[PDB]
Amino acid sequence: SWTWENGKWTWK
């Protein structure tokens, strides 16, 4: 899935 962190979308 997609996780949003500190202004950045990551796959985890």
Side-chain angles (χ1 to χ4, degrees):
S1 290
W2 285 116
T3 342
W4 162 275
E5 214 135 296
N6 190 240
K8 249 268 148 143
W9 273 110
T10 34
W11 181 257
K12 205 263 137 93

